[PDB]
Structures are given as structure tokens and as C-alpha cells.
Design a binder for this molecule. Structure first.
Ligand SMILES: *[C@@H]1O[C@H](CO)[C@@H](O[C@@H]2O[C@H](CO)[C@@H](O[C@@H]3O[C@H](CO)[C@@H](O)[C@H](O)[C@@H]3O)[C@H](O)[C@H]2NC(C)=O)[C@H](O)[C@H]1NC(C)=O
Ligand SMILES: *[C@@H]1O[C@H](CO)[C@@H](O)[C@H](O)[C@H]1NC(C)=O
Ligand SMILES: *[C@@H]1O[C@H](CO)[C@@H](O)[C@H](O)[C@H]1NC(C)=O
Ligand SMILES: *[C@@H]1O[C@H](CO)[C@@H](O)[C@H](O)[C@H]1NC(C)=O
Ligand SMILES: *[C@@H]1O[C@H](CO)[C@@H](O)[C@H](O)[C@H]1NC(C)=O
Ligand SMILES: *[C@@H]1O[C@H](CO)[C@@H](O)[C@H](O)[C@H]1NC(C)=O
Ligand SMILES: [Ca+2]
Ligand SMILES: [Ca+2]
Ligand SMILES: [Ca+2]
Lengths: 97, 343, 338, 324, 162
């Protein structure tokens, strides 16, 4: 189903990232291990997979405890409010009582 | 007279004899199918898992008056077989107690947890049998087994009134008071005795002149040693409630419940929609039977001093039946044909 | 609504749905009990490929063991019978040993042949998890391994439910590698006695197991009779009970005395040490045995109606054995002191 | 006293039992590949663990293999397989192995030792038990399942996003490497609520910890967390014979790290049962006793005790496995 | 403070103190008796605070705190956990007529009694104003639980006669 892109494995030393390495938004920062390239398909390098299909990198929801959170949304945790940008939570600190 | 089950392991005959008999299968409280006459009624008190006074004890009562059962269990009554003589069949939910009227003389009172009382008038004189004696006014002979023999100890006497012959009747407890669970600490034993010495402390001093709290103290010592209570104190307040009920029958109403001693509340069922119309209170003994659009006429309720939570609506706007909210008398049955509610 | 799974014959099993097979193990496999909120368990012990003992487990504190020869224990003790307890009334019946739990809901039997039977309740629909298989009407997916996957080999499915306990460790179970003259199994297909159970159940698996047993035949008539009781009981529980079978070729299922094996015997089993209360016997028909009709049962055996002894303080006395009190004395009539 | 940061250790053992770098203990029991620890600020190394299920039970889990990656040598280096063997980039090799800065060596007690330059020491023996010693240099640059190697144990549930969850399941699920692996639900606490038969034995067996035999070490490391692990292991795993003694040895090794010694091996207990011709002796200071050391006598001899199999003090290890 | 206190020595045994595990008929209700911390109302707390330590506390001081007619030794732990939940803006209700019941209607003007001015409320904002300190304060609980008087805005509550 377009605009899906496929790739083959040159099979020189099996370092190419095949279908075994689908760089989901939740896995982008985490290192990806490659047991060996497998001829498969993947979205463009500038595009990352999502639950349904691959979507812009800057839009995968930030994840707090087992629930979704769209970008720009803020959550208050006891003493401070924090907002997720670039999938990463940013917010100030205030040592309170 | 009255036959009742003090606590949940002891029995009190009609003639006023107290004894101990823990069982776990069906028995016979009182019947009349033993005399040289055709019997009428029969009451069975089969209990579940109550051979030990642990908190898990549950009890069931079945009544066979003519052709029906009532199955007093857990929540409320059943009518599993309608009786052809409902002309004098009533059920009343007064205070915390439930009252059943089954005939001119027979009456039953239930706490809904573990206490059952049976009341008979003078008609049934020397005409009954079972675990409640023969109601003849003589204490000595009110311990006869089912085979016309006078036993010696209650444990053997009770086995003869068993219904099913495959129960593995209880053998006996050879030890003295302070059951196995006690007298091994004399530190838990020394708190139980003082804990329910309140039967003679400050409020029951007037009762003690009329009724001696000797048997009830012993009952308290029992079924508190052998009752591991964890987060539920109902195993304890029941004995004091029974003693207070006995006092009440002699016109000596008492109040004993504090904010830190068996507390009780009845405000939960107080019209949560608004609630500000607080129509529920907790009363000393809240006279028993009050008319409504259920039985718009005085009944024969032989307690008249039922403890619990009560509604005290003004002279008008008497209490309703189902929604538990005082309403003007319009909401009475249109007619009594066929004995149906008819709104 | 009530199912029934039974262990019968020699190394045979039947599930709650009908899918049935053979098995021989050593490790006290799990027979019934949900695997989400257990709350109890039924464990059937084996020994050297045989069927020895049955046990239950409530929570993690109460054990009970029943054994096949009528000996009961508490885990470390030796209790008597019937021995009612915190629920779980151990009793006796028309000749078999019964263990009934109504607060939780189940009934287990052990007859003279050692054939285990367990009946569950409806509220465990789609929730039972043991060796008898899941309890849903669909009858083809009843090989759920403990991992949750599905298999086809009976031994692989059954080996995943083994339970070990300290001193008793167990190994993998392997099918016996032993192979093999009248064919009376077609008795289920020829006579009209079983013709009425045909439209409710399919006799074919019973014939298959009958020939499987026939392969062995370490005896004359033992080839088939054990395979026959099960079919009769199965189509009896289905809603209609076979009447007056056993009169042609059966092998007389055994009980100690009386030998009055028959269907539709009231569990009440009126004796003379009873209050003769009627109308309270509302139990379905249960197969078993008794002793004829002119005799009333006693604790050990049954005796003529005219020799029911009197009882006093737990002691038994023959008729006309007048006891003496300090003030009075009187005689033993037919269990009625006067 | 003078404060000073000292080396940290991440431990993985039992069915699924973790000790983070600081002090935090917990149980995860998830079935997928996970990232145990990474440099996270300079990207010098990475450790990945593969996990599977054992003992055909709901709550029984194991670790099959561990893979280390060292960008220094540019390649996905040694994989520690379930056996004692190791594979360098897909090819099996024979120990010992020497290279520019890597040393992999078979130890006395039938294990493997992987060492890099002056730090990152790893002990792994076959049946799912991993010890990782890390030098103080990596004092604040580490993110993974072992948590940041800081002084506070109250922030070891820090997900890569930046926030710390209160639940263990959510924290664990955040470190997957495959999108297919499912996210486990509530962690089950008592495993032998499903096997009531194995209840008395477990409680009576996992009680030697709170007995006089270990009373000497009762004030070196608190044996509260090592008791529930014993109970869990005995209740859960298929074979209780070796699971019981796979846990006691862990406590004994923990005590040995603080200097306290104990025997804890008596008849009726899983004695080492060393083959003939060798000695079960306690401390022996293994640096000699393998005449490879005889060939090279001037490389190093600096090691503590290991109470492993040894030989009488007149023998050296034979190549084929003898000691005569 | 004082050097003559008979320092507490140690408890050698493991969980299930000597009071537990001597019968294992008890220790079988207590675990189930106060597993209610995750039964029907506390599934929402569990996502914010993990109730392992509170279960451990409940198991303790329940075998060793013998109870006769006074169930207060057990309701307190549940009350503490509910308080901790309430701190995280997550009010819950757990008291019934058959489980640690509490009544505050005894002090309801026995002179008349009909003027029922008191109720029992769970969150019940903590610090109010009366003729004692008619100014805002800094109360860091802000809905202390208990029995509360909630008569109309006008005719505020008094100090001594309540
Ligand atoms: C019904 O079968 C069971 C088991 O098949 C029989 O129980 C067994 O009885 C024998 C006889 O005493 C026990 O042997 C004894 O064991 C003790 C303890 O090990 C030992 O000290 C004695 O010297 C003797 O060897 C055996 O352990 C026991 N097995 C059990 C309880 O599992 C039972 O006797 C049979 N019933 C009848 C009526 O025979
Ligand atoms: C968080 O926001 C502040 C100001 O909005 C910014 O200075 C800071 O760099 C942000 N943090 C990160 C990690 O980008
Ligand atoms: C109980 O009700 C009676 C009659 O309504 C009343 O006289 C009495 O004062 C009430 N008791 C209490 C404590 O309110
Ligand atoms: C049994 O329950 C499971 C889960 O609740 C469900 O998926 C399945 O369809 C059920 N089976 C039947 C026969 O109802
Ligand atoms: C190691 O120490 C010396 C040095 O080689 C050697 O003679 C000795 O045998 C070794 N230790 C033991 C315990 O044998
Ligand atoms: C408790 O007080 C608050 C304060 O506004 C109120 O909103 C709530 O309804 C009260 N709860 C009850 C049960 O009265
Ligand atoms: Ca009398
Ligand atoms: Ca099925
Ligand atoms: Ca940390």
C-alpha cells in the first residue's frame, strides 16, 4: 500500500536494518539490535511508525503511566505541572513541603 | 412463653433451662408431631459451619406450618409454597428485627443474623417437643430425648433430635470453661472477662435486681475466646444486645451504645437525593408495630419494645411501604380483593 | 445446570463436554479449579499408573484426603467418619463415599470400583481450568495447556498440569508401549435397552474404548462391563435414565452387602433411628445399592425391622434389655423406652 | 568518617529478581528483549538481555542470553549463550581470549568473566545469573533497567521520557526493543496460591535465613528481601531441589562481599559435590593452580577467595580436566 | 532520651509474627479480611500509590493486636491509606453499616434533636471560619475527613456550644 517503501539486503555482513528493526516513536531513542538484515519494508528514514501507520516524528504522543497524551498537553503531578515537547517531558522544579 | 438461642451456641428452653450444644446439621427446635394427637407445625434450625463459633457461622430456619416453607436465610423471607390460610399471615420489618405471625398463638422474632425467638401462648400446653422442652412448667423433666428417655448431659440429648442420620454427631468437649483458645494465655483471657463485665458496671445495675446476669456472663466468656474477630465486632455486641432485649421485656429500657463501643448508624438510608429531610433516628426501643398502608389496624406484636432505628413522622403523613418515605395517606391500596398490594 | 466429569475403567478420563481419552500418570494432577481466582482445588493422586486416593484443597490451610479404601485423614491425622467439618461434609450414601461442598459448590464420589465422579455448578461456566477441561458447550477446544496454547497429543496436554510437593517429585509421563475372543461391545448398538440413549449421545467412542480394553482382556468378562457403566450413567445424567438394564450381561457392580444395586434410590435411605419426617426428600435419582425391602439399615449393616436396638448415653442395647435407674427402671421396646 | 563514592553493582538473578545499581530490589517478569544498561551520555557500551518462560508456569521466567556491544571495536561483540560458551560476531571461540582491551576467561567455579579496561566487569554462568560491576567513573551517566548510578535509590523508576512512574509494570514496559512483545498486566505476587501442595515445604525450607546459622551476617545485610525471593523461587519454579540452593548461595555471596563468611553447607543440603580428584575447600586464592599461569608467571596475581573446587597443594590443573 | 529504657532487643522470626502462624486458621482471614485495599474502591488509588507497605502494616499489628469488642485497632490503617489517597485529590468512600461504622449524630442537640445539623463527610474541606479566626489560614490537608456541620451560609457555626 503506497507510499510504503521496501528494501533488500545486500548480505555482505548483515548490518542493514531490515524489517526486524521498525523504529517506532517509542523506540527511536532506544538502540536497535540487528540479528541480521531481512528483506522487508520500512517507511522513509525521516518517517517513524505509529500504532496504525507511520506519522510525523514530532506528533507521537508522550506516554505517562499507561495512557495517551497528545503533544502540548500538560499534567500536574502533586506539586508541579509538566508538558511534553518532542515526546520528552519538560517542566520546572519546586521542592515543596 | 419464649424459646430463644442466646448467642450462637447455647439454648434456653421454654421453662427456663440454659445449656450448651454445638451442632452443624439440621435439628428440630419445636414441633407437636410427638403427642397422641395430629401435629400442626414444625421448625428446623439447620445451621451451616457453626460447629465452632468462628465468624463464618451462618444459620438457616425452615418453617412448615401447613404446606409452605419460609426459608429464613440471609436477607428476608421466602414463600416457596403459598399456604392456603394466609388469612393470618403477616411479616413486619420493625427496627432491626423481623416479626412473623403464623397463627393465633405461634409467633417468631428474628434479628436477621443469629438469634431466633419463638413465642407460644397458653394453648400449646404440654403439647410440644424438641430442643425447647415440653412447656409444662417443670424444669427437671425438660431434657427428654426423642425416645422417651431422660438424658444426663446436653450433648447426648441433642443428638436424638437430629433430622438426617448421617451427620457425625458432635462427640463432646471434656475441658472446662475458657475453651482451648483461652487459658493458654491468661492475657487474652484476662481482657475478655473485664471487657464484658459491663453487664454490671453502671447501666445494668437496675436490671440486676430483676434478672441475674449470671448465665449471660458465661455466654460472653464463651464464643469470644473461640471467635477470632478481625475487623468485624458483631461476634461480641450480640450478647449484650440479647441481654438488653431481655431487660426490655421487664419495662427497664436501657441505653448502652457509645461512640467507641459497638457503634451503630441508620442514616445511610436517608434519601440521598436530598437527605436534608432527616427522617431516621436511633431510638431506645422504638415501639414495635406501627400502622401504614400495609395493615391499617393494630396487630398482636408481643415485643412492643423493639430496639433499632425508627422514623418519627408527625401525626399526619404516615410512613409508606416500599420507598421508605412518609407520604400522605392517599397511597393506600385501592381495594383488598385477592389480598394484593394494588399500590 | 450441572456437569459431571469422571475417571473410570483403568487409565481413562472423561471431560465436562464429552471429548475423552486415556492417560496414566504419577504426579497428583489437577482435576478442577479455576486458574484466575482459585479459591479451591481438586487433586487426584495416582500411583504406578493406577488410581489411588482423592483430595481437595481450600485456600492453603485445609487438606482432607479420602483414599480409595475408605480411610480418611486430615493431612497429618486419621479422622473417623462421617466427620462433618467447616463445610465439606464427608458422608456415606447408597454404598459409595461422598464429599459434598455446598458453600463452594461441588460433589465428589468414590464407588467400590474406585471410579471418581465430580459434579460442579453453573457459576463456573467458561472458568474451570483443570484436567477435566474447560467447561463450555463447545467440545473441541478442551486441550488447553497451562501455557494457554492448544495441542492435540493427550499426553502433552496432560503433563502440563502435574503438581509436585517437596518429598514427592515427579517425572515426564510416557505412553505405555504395549500392544495386544468375543465382541460384546456391539451390545450398545444392537439391543433396544440402549436404543433410547442413542439420540442424545454417540456410542462410537464408547465402542472404541471397549475394543481398546478388549485388546487386553486379562479376564473373562471384564473386557466390556467397566466400559458399560459409564455410558449408562452418562446418558442417565443427560435427562432420561435407563430403566431395568443390567439384566442381560452386566457384571454386577459391587457393594459390600445387600447388593441391591438399582437406579432411582432415594438418598434419604429411611432407617429406624429417624424422626420419619416426610416431604423433605427432594433429591434426584442416584444410582447405588441397598438391601431388600423388609430390612432397615443400621450403622454397619441392615437388620429386620424387629431388632432395632435402643440407645442410651451412646450405648446400644438389644430389645428387652431393661435398664435400672435409682428410682425406676423399664424395658427396651422397638427403640422406645417406656 | 569521610564520604567517597565506591563501585556499584547491578545484579540479575532468580526467576526474575533485580538489584539496581543503588540498592533497589524488585521483580518484573516480562518476556521480551530489554536494555539492561547503557553509557547514555557518551555511548561507550550497551547490554541487552533476552528473556523467556520456564517451568511451564504463569509466574516462572528466565533469562537466556546477554549480548554486549562495544562501539570501541565497531562490532556487535561477544554474545553470552545459555551454555558456558561465547560467540564473537557469530563464531564460537575457545577461552581464554585476549585482544587490545578485552579479556574473556573461564573462572574456577564454572562461570565466565568478561573484563574491559579497568572497569565494566561481568560475571555470567550459564543458568541465568548476571553480576555487573561498574567503576565510579560512570557515576552519573547511565540510563537503563539498572537506573542511574547516583546516590539516591528513590529515582530508579525513571522512564526514558523523563518522569518516574509509581508502578513497576509501566516502568518495565518502557524499555522494550520489539513492538510485537505484549505489555504484561498486574504482576502476580504469590505464585503458590496456585500450587497449594507446595506450601508447607516452602515456608519450612526458606526459614534458615532467619536462623542462628546466619546470625553472624544478620547485621551486614538485612535478610528481609532475600526471604521473599526464596519463597517465590521455591513456590514457582518447576524443580525445588536446586531452586532452594540457588537462592541460599545468593545470600551467602552477598554476605561474602561485606567480608563475613559462613559455611551453610551440611549433609542434607546441596553440597557442591565436586568430582573426584578435586577439593571443595574454602578460600584458596586462585591465581596459580592452572599451569597456564605456570607458563605465564608474571602477568598478575590479585584476587580474593572463591571457595571453589581446588586441588591439594602439590598439583596443577591438567589441560584435559585432570589435576594429577 | 533516657539511658534506662531496656532497649528493645530484636524480633528474630520472619513475617507472620509469633501471634500469626501458630494456628494458620487465623492468618487466613486477616490476609483476606484486609485485602479490601484492592477490592472495589481502591483500583483508582492503586494507579497513584502502590499499597504494598500498607498491606504489610495491616498484616502486622493485627495478629499481635488482640481485639475484643473494639475493632478500632484495624480501621485505623484503612483510614490512613484513605487519607493518603485523599491527599492526591482522589477522595474515596469505604465505610459501610457492617464495616467500621462511624456515627456523629449523638451530639445533635438532644434538647430538640429534630434540628439535625451534623453529617458524616469524606473530604469535607478542612478549615472554615467562625467567631474564632474569621480569616483564611494555611491548613495543608484542606479536606480533613470526619463528621461535619453544613448549615446554610448565613448563621455560621459557633465556638463553644457547637
Ligand atoms: C488404604 O490405603 C492406604 C494407602 O494405600 C493405607 O495407608 C497406609 O497404611 C499403612 C499401614 O500402616 C502405612 O504404613 C505405615 O506407615 C508408617 C509411616 O510411614 C510407618 O511408620 C509404619 O511402619 C507403616 O509402614 C502407610 O504409610 C499408609 N499410607 C498412607 C497413609 O498413605 C491404608 O491403611 C488403607 N486402608 C486400610 C483399611 O487398610
Ligand atoms: C524546558 O523549557 C525551558 C523554558 O521553556 C527551556 O529553557 C528548557 O531548555 C526546556 N528543557 C529542555 C530539555 O528543552
Ligand atoms: C422513642 O420513641 C418514643 C415514641 O415515639 C419516644 O417517646 C421516645 O422519646 C423515643 N426515644 C428517643 C431516644 O428518641
Ligand atoms: C469465555 O471467556 C472468554 C474471555 O472472557 C471469551 O473470550 C470466550 O469467548 C468465552 N467463551 C464462551 C464460550 O463464552
Ligand atoms: C599458589 O601459591 C604458590 C605460588 O605458586 C603455590 O606454591 C601454591 O601451591 C598455590 N596455592 C595453593 C593453595 O596451592
Ligand atoms: C462534603 O462536603 C463537600 C463540600 O462542598 C460537598 O461538596 C460534598 O457533597 C459533601 N459530601 C457529603 C457526602 O455530604
Ligand atoms: Ca416443661
Ligand atoms: Ca469446552
Ligand atoms: Ca537512582
Amino acid at each position: 500500500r503506497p507510499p510504503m517503501v521496501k528494501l533488500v539486503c545486500p548480505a555482505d555482513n548483515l548490518r542493514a536494518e531490515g524489517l526486524e528493526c521498525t523504529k517506532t516513536c517509542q523506540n527511536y531513542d532506544l538502540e536497535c539490535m540487528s540479528m541480521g538484515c531481512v528483506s522487508g519494508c520500512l517507511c522513509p528514514p525521516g518517517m517513524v511508525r505509529h500504532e496504525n501507520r507511520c506519522v510525523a516524528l514530532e506528533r507521537c504522543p508522550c506516554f505517562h503511566q499507561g495512557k495517551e497524551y497528545a503533544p502540548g498537553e500538560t499534567v500536574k503531578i502533586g506539586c508541579n505541572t509538566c508538558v511534553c515537547r518532542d515526546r520528552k517531558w519538560n517542566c520546572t522544579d519546586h521542592v515543596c513541603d | 412463653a419464649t424459646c430463644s438461642t442466646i448467642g450462637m451456641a447455647h439454648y434456653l428452653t421454654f421453662d427456663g433451662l440454659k445449656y450448651l450444644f454445638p451442632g452443624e446439621c439440621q435439628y428440630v427446635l419445636v414441633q407437636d408431631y410427638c403427642g397422641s394427637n395430629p401435629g400442626t407445625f414444625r421448625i428446623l434450625v439447620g445451621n451451616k459451619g457453626c460447629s465452632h463459633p468462628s465468624v463464618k457461622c451462618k444459620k438457616r430456619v425452615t418453617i412448615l406450618v401447613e404446606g409452605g416453607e419460609i426459608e429464613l436465610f440471609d436477607g428476608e423471607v421466602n414463600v416457596k409454597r403459598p399456604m392456603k390460610d394466609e388469612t393470618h399471615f403477616e411479616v413486619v420489618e420493625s427496627g432491626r428485627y423481623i416479626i412473623l405471625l403464623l397463627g393465633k398463638a405461634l409467633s417468631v422474632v428474628w434479628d436477621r443474623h443469629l438469634s431466633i425467638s419463638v413465642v407460644l401462648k397458653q394453648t400449646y400446653q404440654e403439647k410440644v417437643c424438641g430442643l425447647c422442652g415440653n412447656f409444662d412448667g417443670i424444669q427437671n423433666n425438660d431434657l427428654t430425648s426423642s425416645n422417651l428417655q431422660v438424658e444426663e448431659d446436653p450433648v447426648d440429648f441433642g443428638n436424638s433430635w437430629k433430622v438426617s442420620s448421617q451427620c457425625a454427631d458432635t462427640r463432646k468437649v471434656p475441658l472446662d470453661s475458657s475453651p482451648a483458645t483461652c487459658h493458654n494465655n491468661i492475657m487474652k483471657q484476662t481482657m475478655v472477662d473485664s471487657s464484658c463485665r459491663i453487664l454490671t458496671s453502671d447501666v445494668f445495675q437496675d436490671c440486676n435486681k430483676l434478672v441475674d446476669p449470671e448465665p449471660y456472663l458465661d455466654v460472653c466468656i464463651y464464643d469470644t475466646c473461640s471467635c477470632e474477630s478481625i475487623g468485624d465486632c458483631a461476634c461480641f455486641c450480640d450478647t449484650i444486645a440479647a441481654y438488653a432485649h431481655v431487660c426490655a421485656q421487664h419495662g427497664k429500657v436501657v441505653t448502652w451504645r457509645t461512640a467507641t463501643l459497638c457503634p451503630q448508624s441508620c442514616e445511610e438510608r436517608n434519601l440521598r437525593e436530598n437527605g436534608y429531610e432527616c427522617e431516621w433516628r436511633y431510638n431506645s426501643c422504638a415501639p414495635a408495630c406501627q400502622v401504614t398502608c400495609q395493615h391499617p389496624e393494630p396487630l398482636a406484636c408481643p415485643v412492643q419494645c423493639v430496639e433499632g432505628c425508627h422514623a418519627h413522622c408527625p401525626p399526619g403523613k404516615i410512613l409508606d411501604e416500599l420507598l421508605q418515605t412518609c407520604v400522605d395517606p392517599e397511597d393506600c391500596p385501592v381495594c383488598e380483593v385477592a389480598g394484593r398490594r394494588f399500590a | 445446570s450441572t456437569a459431571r466429569c469422571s475417571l473410570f475403567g483403568s487409565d481413562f478420563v472423561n471431560t465436562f463436554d464429552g471429548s475423552m481419552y486415556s492417560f496414566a500418570g504419577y504426579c497428583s494432577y489437577l482435576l478442577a479449579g479455576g486458574c484466575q481466582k482459585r479459591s479451591f482445588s481438586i487433586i487426584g493422586d495416582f500411583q504406578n499408573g493406577k488410581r489411588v486416593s482423592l483430595s481437595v484443597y481450600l485456600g492453603e490451610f485445609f487438606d482432607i484426603h479420602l483414599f480409595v479404601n475408605g480411610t480418611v485423614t486430615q493431612g497429618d491425622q486419621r479422622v473417623s467418619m462421617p466427620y462433618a467439618s467447616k463445610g465439606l461434609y464427608l458422608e456415606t450414601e447408597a454404598g459409595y463415599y461422598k464429599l459434598s461442598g455446598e458453600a463452594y459448590g461441588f460433589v465428589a464420589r468414590i464407588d467400590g470400583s474406585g471410579n471418581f465422579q465430580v459434579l460442579l455448578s453453573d457459576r463456573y461456566f467458561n472458568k474451570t481450568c483443570g484436567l477435566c477441561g474447560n467447561f463450555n458447550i463447545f467440545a473441541e477446544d478442551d486441550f488447553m495447556t497451562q501455557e494457554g496454547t492448544l495441542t492435540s497429543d493427550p499426553y502433552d496436554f496432560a503433563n502440563s498440569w502435574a503438581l509436585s510437593s517437596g518429598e514427592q517429585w515427579c517425572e515426564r509421563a510416557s505412553p505405555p508401549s504395549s500392544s495386544c475372543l468375543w465382541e460384546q461391545c456391539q451390545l450398545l448398538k444392537s439391543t433396544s435397552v440402549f436404543a433410547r440413549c442413542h439420540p442424545l449421545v454417540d456410542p462410537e467412542p464408547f465402542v472404541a474404548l471397549c475394543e481398546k480394553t478388549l485388546c487386553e482382556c486379562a479376564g473373562g468378562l471384564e473386557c466390556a462391563c467397566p466400559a458399560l457403566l459409564e455410558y449408562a450413567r452418562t446418558c442417565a445424567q443427560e435427562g432420561m435414565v435407563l430403566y431395568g438394564w443390567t439384566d442381560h450381561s452386566a457384571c454386577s457392580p459391587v457393594c459390600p452387602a445387600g447388593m441391591e444395586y438399582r437406579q432411582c434410590v432415594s438418598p434419604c435411605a429411611r432407617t429406624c433411628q429417624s424422626l420419619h419426617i416426610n416431604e423433605m426428600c427432594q433429591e434426584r435419582c442416584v444410582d447405588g445399592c441397598s438391601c431388600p425391602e423388609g430390612q432397615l439399615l443400621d450403622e454397619g449393616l441392615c437388620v429386620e425391622s424387629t431388632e432395632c436396638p435402643c440407645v442410651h448415653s451412646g450405648k446400644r442395647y438389644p430389645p428387652g434389655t431393661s435398664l435400672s435407674r435409682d428410682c425406676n427402671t423399664c424395658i427396651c421396646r422397638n427403640s422406645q423406652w417406656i | 568518617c569521610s564520604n567517597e563514592e565506591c563501585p556499584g553493582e547491578c545484579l540479575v538473578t532468580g526467576q526474575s529478581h533485580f538489584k539496581s545499581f543503588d540498592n533497589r530490589y524488585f521483580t518484573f517478569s516480562g518476556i521480551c528483549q530489554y536494555l539492561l544498561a547503557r553509557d547514555c551520555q557518551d555511548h561507550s557500551f550497551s547490554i541487552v538481555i533476552e528473556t523467556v518462560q520456564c517451568a511451564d508456569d504463569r509466574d516462572a521466567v528466565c533469562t537466556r542470553s546477554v549480548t554486549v556491544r562495544l562501539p570501541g571495536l565497531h562490532n556487535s561483540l561477544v554474545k553470552l549463550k545459555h551454555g558456558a560458551g561465547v560467540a564473537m560476531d557469530g563464531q564460537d571461540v575457545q577461552l581464554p581470549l585476549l585482544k587490545g582491551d578485552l579479556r574473556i576467561q573461564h573462572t574456577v567455579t564454572a562461570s565466565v568473566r568478561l573484563s574491559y579496561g579497568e572497569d565494566l566487569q561481568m560475571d555470567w554462568d550459564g543458568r541465568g545469573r548476571l553480576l555487573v560491576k561498574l567503576s565510579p567513573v560512570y557515576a552519573g551517566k547511565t540510563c537503563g533497567l539498572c537506573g542511574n548510578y547516583n546516590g539516591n535509590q528513590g529515582d530508579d523508576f525513571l522512564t526514558p521520557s523523563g518522569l518516574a512512574e509509581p508502578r513497576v509494570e509501566d516502568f518495565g514496559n518502557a524499555w522494550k526493543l520489539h513492538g510485537d512483545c505484549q505489555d504484561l498486566q498486574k504482576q502476580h505476587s504469590d505464585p503458590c496460591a496456585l500450587n497449594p501442595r507446595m506450601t508447607r515445604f516452602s515456608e519450612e525450607a526458606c526459614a534458615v535465613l532467619t536462623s542462628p546459622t546466619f546470625e553472624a551476617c544478620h547485621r551486614a545485610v538485612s535478610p528481609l528481601p532475600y526471604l521473599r525471593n526464596c519463597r517465590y523461587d521455591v513456590c514457582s519454579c518447576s524443580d525445588g531441589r536446586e531452586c532452594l540452593c540457588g537462592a541460599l548461595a545468593s545470600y551467602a555471596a552477598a554476605c561474602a562481599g561485606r567480608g563475613v563468611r559462613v559455611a551453610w553447607r551440611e549433609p542434607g543440603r546441596c553440597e557442591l559435590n565436586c568430582p573426584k580428584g578435586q577439593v571443595y575447600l574454602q578460600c584458596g586464592t586462585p591465581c596459580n593452580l592452572t599451569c597456564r599461569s605456570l607458563s605465564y608467571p608474571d602477568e598478575e596475581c590479585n584476587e580474593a577467595c572463591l571457595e571453589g573446587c581446588f586441588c591439594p597443594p602439590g598439583l596443577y590443573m591438567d589441560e584435559r580436566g585432570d589435576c594429577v
